[PDB]
């Protein structure tokens, strides 16, 4: 069984996928309803790297503090996968702590438009990063859940962070489609399936970790 570690109220939890990769999950509170959100923690020889922040600054601060204490190293970098609050809500905390906040230019453009502090806008359609020995690829597959959503691939593990482009099994509909492109979203998923033909685990933006079947599930929800 996978190691799971929580804060006191259970609003932040980390679950181990392998020696150096954990999923972080936080509960936001909205109209009295708990709404969970996932990202990744990468434990690298040169610091911790997160995929996504959290709903707000309070949660982002607590997440950073938890992982820095546990892994005994600093959070150095975060990859922001689109400009909604569950992804980027902690950007003020990142910037003031000197944590590098990577994003596409479009994500940065949308963040600014919406009144958030800006991430770096450094990621291209395909970008390859390396942190210590940890390899990370970012990929913009096209519009879907939002116009700017990217996925993150760990080629040493064939782990895909689908983010909010990819729905969990428990999701029975597409959720928030105000900012979505539902006629393009299938093609974007197909672009991911074509790029990564052998996938070991898929982390959705919300809900339980799964596998390639989550991509197929999302295709079915788009019919
Ligand atoms: Zn979103
Ligand atoms: Zn989301």
Author numbering: 35 to 257
Anything the authors wrote about it?
β-Lactam-containing compounds remain the most important antibiotics in clinical use, but their effectiveness is threatened by increasing resistance. β-Lactam resistance is most importantly mediated by serine- and zinc-dependent metallo-β-lactamases (SBLs and MBLs, respectively), which catalyze β-lactam hydrolysis. B1 MBLs (e.g., imipenemase [IMP], Verona integron-encoded MBL [VIM], and New Delhi MBL [NDM] types) are the most clinically relevant MBLs; these MBLs catalyze hydrolysis of almost all β-lactams, including the latest generations of cephalosporins and carbapenems. Crystal structures reveal that MBLs have a characteristic αβ/βα sandwich fold, that they possess conserved zinc ion binding sites, and that loops flanking the active site are involved in ligand binding. We report systematic studies on the inhibition of four clinically relevant MBLs (IMP-1, VIM-2, SPM-1, and NDM-1) and the model MBL BcII by the four captopril stereoisomers and both enantiomers of a captopril derivative, 1-(2-mercaptobenzoyl)pyrrolidine-2-carboxylic acid (d- and l-MBP).
